[PDB]
């Protein structure tokens, strides 16, 4: 085996490149804790 | 100076979110032993600054030395020459008059 590239005239596939847009970003990162001391801003402590 | 216990207790309730003004009022309304110069009872292992006031046996003492010092286990207000008090000067003077 020998590794080469993909071409639209030897196969029908190419490299797929698209543009990144800042305002359409979604994060995938969940907080480990919530609502407890040490993990929230002072504005968000509800004094339960 | 601004608020009482019954006024401060009114900002912390079963359903009350926090804010910085509550802590500002909490800090201003209690006694700050560094900024108002009063430390209560003398303790060994504490550092003091010029002007501090401390209660040792039956007297209040103000520190005279201008540089920071450390409470030595041996150096106690009355033994050393850092501290000062009037209830001892006047005591000795009146004792002298009494003896004379």
Q: What length does chain A have? A: 48
Strand, coil or helix: B22: helix
Distances (CA, A) of A30 to A34, A40, A41, A43: 10, 14, 17, 20
Rg (CA), chain A: 24
Smallest Cα distance from B26 to chain A, Å? 15
Q: How far apart are CA B78 and CA B57, in angstroms?
A: 10
Calculate the CA B94 to chain-centre distance: 27
Number of CB pairs, chain A paired with chain B, less than 8 A apart: 24
Resolved by: cryo-EM
On whether the CB atoms of residues B61 and B83 are closer than 8 A, the answer is yes
- CB spacing of A42 vs B18 below 8 angstroms: yes
Chain A residues with CB-CB distance to B14 below 8 A: 47-48
Query: Whose CA is closest to B52, among B19, B16, B77, B87?
Result: B77
- CB spacing of A43 vs B18 below 8 angstroms: yes
Query: Whose CA is closest to B70, among B43, B30, B31?
Result: B43
Q: How far apart are CA B20 and CA B98, in angstroms?
A: 59
Chain A residues with CB-CB distance to B18 below 8 A: 42-47
Rg (CA), chain B: 20
- CB spacing of A42 vs B20 below 8 angstroms: yes
Q: How far apart are CA B39 and CA B28, in angstroms?
A: 17
């Amino acid at each position: 085996s020998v590794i080469t590239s993909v071409s639209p005239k030897t196969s029908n596939q190419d490299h797929m490149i698209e543009e990144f847009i800042e305002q359409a970003i979604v994060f995938n990162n969940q907080k480990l804790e919530s609502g407890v001391l040490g993990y929230e801003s002072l504005n968000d402590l509800e004094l339960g | 100076n601004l608020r009482k216990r019954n006024e401060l207790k009114s900002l912390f309730k079963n359903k009350s979110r926090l804010s910085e003004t509550y802590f500002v009022e909490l800090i201003d309304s209690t006694l700050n032993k560094r900024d108002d110069r009063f430390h209560g009872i003398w303790k060994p292992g504490q550092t003091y600054q010029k002007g501090d006031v401390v209660y040792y046996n039956h007297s209040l003492w103000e520190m005279q030395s201008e540089n920071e010092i450390c409470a030595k286990e041996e150096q106690t207000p009355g033994i050393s020459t850092d501290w000062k008090s009037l209830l001892k000067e006047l005591e000795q003077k009146v004792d002298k008059l009494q003896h004379e």
